[PDB]
Symmetry: D2
Subunit: 250 residues, 4 copies
Amino acid sequence: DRLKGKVAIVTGGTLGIGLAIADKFVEEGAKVVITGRHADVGEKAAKSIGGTDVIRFVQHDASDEAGWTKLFDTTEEAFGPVTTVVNNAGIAVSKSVEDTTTEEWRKLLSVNLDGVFFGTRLGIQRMKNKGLGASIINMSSIEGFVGDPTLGAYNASKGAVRIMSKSAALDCALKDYDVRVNTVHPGYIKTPLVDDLEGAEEMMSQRTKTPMGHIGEPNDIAWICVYLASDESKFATGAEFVVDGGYTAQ
Amino acid sequence: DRLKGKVAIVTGGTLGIGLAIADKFVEEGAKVVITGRHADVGEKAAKSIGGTDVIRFVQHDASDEAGWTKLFDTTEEAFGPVTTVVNNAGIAVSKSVEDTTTEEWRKLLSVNLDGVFFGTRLGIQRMKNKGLGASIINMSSIEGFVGDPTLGAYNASKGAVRIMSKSAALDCALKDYDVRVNTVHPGYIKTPLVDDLEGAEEMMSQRTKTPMGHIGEPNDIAWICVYLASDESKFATGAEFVVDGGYTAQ
Amino acid sequence: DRLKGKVAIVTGGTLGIGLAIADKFVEEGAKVVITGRHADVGEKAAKSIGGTDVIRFVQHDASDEAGWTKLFDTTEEAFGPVTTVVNNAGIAVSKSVEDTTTEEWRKLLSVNLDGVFFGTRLGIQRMKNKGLGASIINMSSIEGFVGDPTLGAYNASKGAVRIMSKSAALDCALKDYDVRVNTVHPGYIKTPLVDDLEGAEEMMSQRTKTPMGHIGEPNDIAWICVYLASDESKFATGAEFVVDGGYTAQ
Amino acid sequence: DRLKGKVAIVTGGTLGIGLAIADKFVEEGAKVVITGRHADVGEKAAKSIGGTDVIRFVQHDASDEAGWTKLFDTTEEAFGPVTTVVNNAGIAVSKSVEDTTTEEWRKLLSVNLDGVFFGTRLGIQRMKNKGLGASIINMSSIEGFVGDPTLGAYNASKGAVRIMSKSAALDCALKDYDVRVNTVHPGYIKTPLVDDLEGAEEMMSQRTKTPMGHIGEPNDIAWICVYLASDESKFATGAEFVVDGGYTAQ
Ligand SMILES: [Mg+2]
Ligand SMILES: [Mg+2]
């Protein structure tokens, strides 16, 4: 068990990428709380992985600052001290910077940026100085690395997460908090969200997009998260982890 | 005159970096509108560079979305079609991610991020398809590249500006808008803000910080902006320009 | 066993980083050939990890092009088809670009650059199209990311390894070779070489160097290589993996 | 005259990119020595820009270490102390890492890497501590940033130049040598070399390659070199300058 004794919060954990991360975390012996906006989906999501001795659903909107403090108390009350925060909750808008409304601009940043900030900030306050091998894993993207002309606000959010985590990682390092902070940069990953977008996977699978000629699967992101959640990565902080089938290598 | 016929809006243009950018722009034959929050500082700032045939002050808070539209109308009414937007307005908070209040978080992002978004978006809408050699120059930072443990929210903002601008450049490139978008990444620059911070220049001048052993001067940032504003840089877009005395090279 | 059925060649595998990589690889069920220049060191290195059913020493200088072919034949004869090449062999010279003799320049590049090229090229030729989950792992450095004023030729080499590997990954991806190529970028790692350098660990442990306040240990590099060698990382190619205690994050 | 009093050596200066750099340098008032392997081409190249009071051809192979010392003596004897070295000489091979012969591997690195090293090293020794506003400009590439599956050895060379220059820049900075070192990263630039390759510009102009939909012209690289050669860039060292029509921004 590579995550023995670990206690993790995975936001957006009821579907797609966060679901697999949750799945593999429990598999490696961690206790897990997954968050989502819908109780029915969330409960069934948690149950699909295991019983309440290893995983629980908690309804939480990642942009809900007050809820974050509650989320931590509930998790600790369930499983004990939190060791791992995976800020995975995120939304995407398909708009150019030119075509981005302010309502869209602020809605997306509310989840993608403020949510990652709330979880990082709270995670540091709660996990520092307890010798937990604590780990904050902030879900950025390939869109944190390069631009996409139709993902303006998303790019801003993922680029914001990338460098902020470095800020967080340095602080924790310098203050011996025993908290690492890192970013994971998924390329295109096959999720039900992508399967809803007609022709999207086909677009993403083009060699000019993803060199390997296919997009990834949620477990590809899950395994890199396990590495970063485990003490195997005790010397890695402030770094970006790219799993994109070669998207950003060209 | 390398900026002949250019018409520029320089936000935060009444002091430090934006002041010199304005100064050199007029020197190269551009017409310039500078923005600031204080009229007494702003008017005198404009007068120190030239008369109203080449430069004007406009009171505007860069986080003021509605004001951005007024700013464009006033500039075009004064000088004709805008060819150059310099998103330079920005504030800094000296707090770790851990110690960052949400008010500080939102105040800083409102100027540093929303303001760059407002000016980029409006700038694209207003400058596209007019064959102006149009140029959007977004002021990021060395803090868009690496972390600083006491600049959490600032890192987030400058990282957001870095990758969003890339989004913007691609769209403009792909759509033949004749608008380039680029980022400038100043290192430590001697400004009245820095001279107000006791011992700050001395900290920034340490070789572990700035290899050259001194910090820069506003004209150092001014000249790279001129390059980016002129048609000498017609093939440069979506790229980052670093002037930091070697800060990020180590 | 995360490396079940894997067959690996670890160059420079008799000491420090390559030693632990070899150690953990066998631990995860891989068969391993380690290379070195000295038989007494090498044989004992192999014996310390296991018997000849799981690990063997082979005397080979990584700059030895002809030897590379012998190395592959011996490994396959011993263990079957090679699935994993770890280009880890490398030397360092403590000279500025200014003070670098051409002999030092060429000696270092012969091991650090030519050796990684020889092993990548041969590895691709030998491992492609066999459905092995084949993985080339090229040992770069933090010195592939940023400069060091007293490591001129080393920077050149590690920067060469970083971008060449990307070339390699794309080709393998685009041609469906089933070979991934990635780079690992160790920061300062406690090795017998470092313990031989008086005061070196102390210099590397300074917060201006390594934020965490200590340097790493060979197992820190070992575990990221395992990740990259296993099918957990099947969607990762052309990417850089940084384990440096935060060195490059500031 | 932005290059008043400057004395520059431009290798590969008889054609394409180096030719324009030479052209614009003289235009900005610098004295220039251009190098090439053919006397007839070189002489006519120099004459096309001006008389021997402002530019001279010198036959030199950039991989010729001994010749470098001669090149410096001849230039200084002609125009006085050298202030600017532009390492622009370079060759490309269209081979994958897999398909790269060692003869090709070593030939390309001999010009692209050893040549840049010889010029950087010699430039530092000769230009330091003379208050010349000295500038070393090393021609890397977009291929110093991302991989290309058919430019294996080229990628290695341009990635090597990128990080080595940082090494050089840090050293000069830390030692107050008054020498900056920087890299320029051309994307696709229309040269007679490209015009010789059938369908190449058409390939390079595809939106999936260069967002702007066309490739650049030698003067695009020329102007960024002028900036870096002038004292306008006195605070820029160890940085990469990307002029690629958006190639690397996606
Ligand atoms: Mg750094
Ligand atoms: Mg790319």
